[PDB]
Amino acid sequence: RVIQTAGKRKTAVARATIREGKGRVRINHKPVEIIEPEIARFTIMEPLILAGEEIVSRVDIDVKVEGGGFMGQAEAARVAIARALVEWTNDMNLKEKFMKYDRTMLVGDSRRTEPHKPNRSTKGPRAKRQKSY
Template sequence: MEKQDGIIMPTPKKVLVVSGKRKTAVARAIIKPGVGKVRINLTPVEIYAPDIAKAKIMEPLLQAGGEVWQQVDMDVKTSGGGYMGQAEAARMAIANGLLKWTKSTHLRTVFSEYDRTMIAGDSRSKETKKFGGAGARSKEQKSYR
C-alpha cells in the first residue's frame, strides 16, 4: 500500500496484454507476475493437444530460457482459425509478451535469429473467393461451339 495525499492507495500490479495474429486466428495473452504457469484456453501448456501445436507454442519459452518465463504467469485465449493457426498466434503473443516484459534486446535477437515470424508475424492469409467461380481465381468454363 502506498500513501498518496493522505489516501492509502494499493500498489499497482504490472500486467501486460499482448495479442498475436495468424490468418484468421487471434490470440490474446495476459502476462502477470507469477511462477511460470502458461495456459492456453485454460489448459496448461504441458498437456495441450495436439503435440505439434504444443511444440509450436513452446518454441519462444524454450528459446527464452527458464529463468525468463518462470517469473511470469501467462493466460492465452485463442479464437478463430484452425488449431495450427491458433498455435502460431499464441506463439507470437507469448514471444511479444516476453519481449515487452523483459525489455531485452538480447532476447529480441535470439527470437529473430531463430524465427522472425515469432516477433513480426506472417501476413499471408487465404485469398477471398470472387464471383463467377468456385474459388479465388477459378472461373466457370464456357464453350461457344
C-alpha cells in the same frame, strides 16, 4: 504489475496477459503441457524453450485465443507470447535471438485468402473445369 499483448494469424486472434508467478502457462483455461497435437504444442512452447528457465519460472501467462483453426490459434499464441516476454524483460539479447531464429515470432504473417472467381468458384480462384473439345 501486469502486461497485455495480442497476436493475429489468419482469421484467429489471441490476447495474452503476463504477470509475476511460478512458470504456469494456460491456453483457454488448460495447461500448455497437455496441448494436443505435438505439432501445435511445440509451436506454442518454442519461445519459452528459447527464453529459458531463469526467465519463465518467474512469470505466469494466460492466453485467450478464438477464431481460425488450431494451427492458426497456436501460431497467434506463439506470437503474442514472444511479444509479451520481450516487452516484460525489455531485453535485447532475447530479441536478437528470436530474430535470428524466426522473425515471424515478433513480426506477424500478412497472408490471407484470395477471393474465388467463376468457372468453379467453389474450388478456388484459379482452378477451372476441363475441356475435351
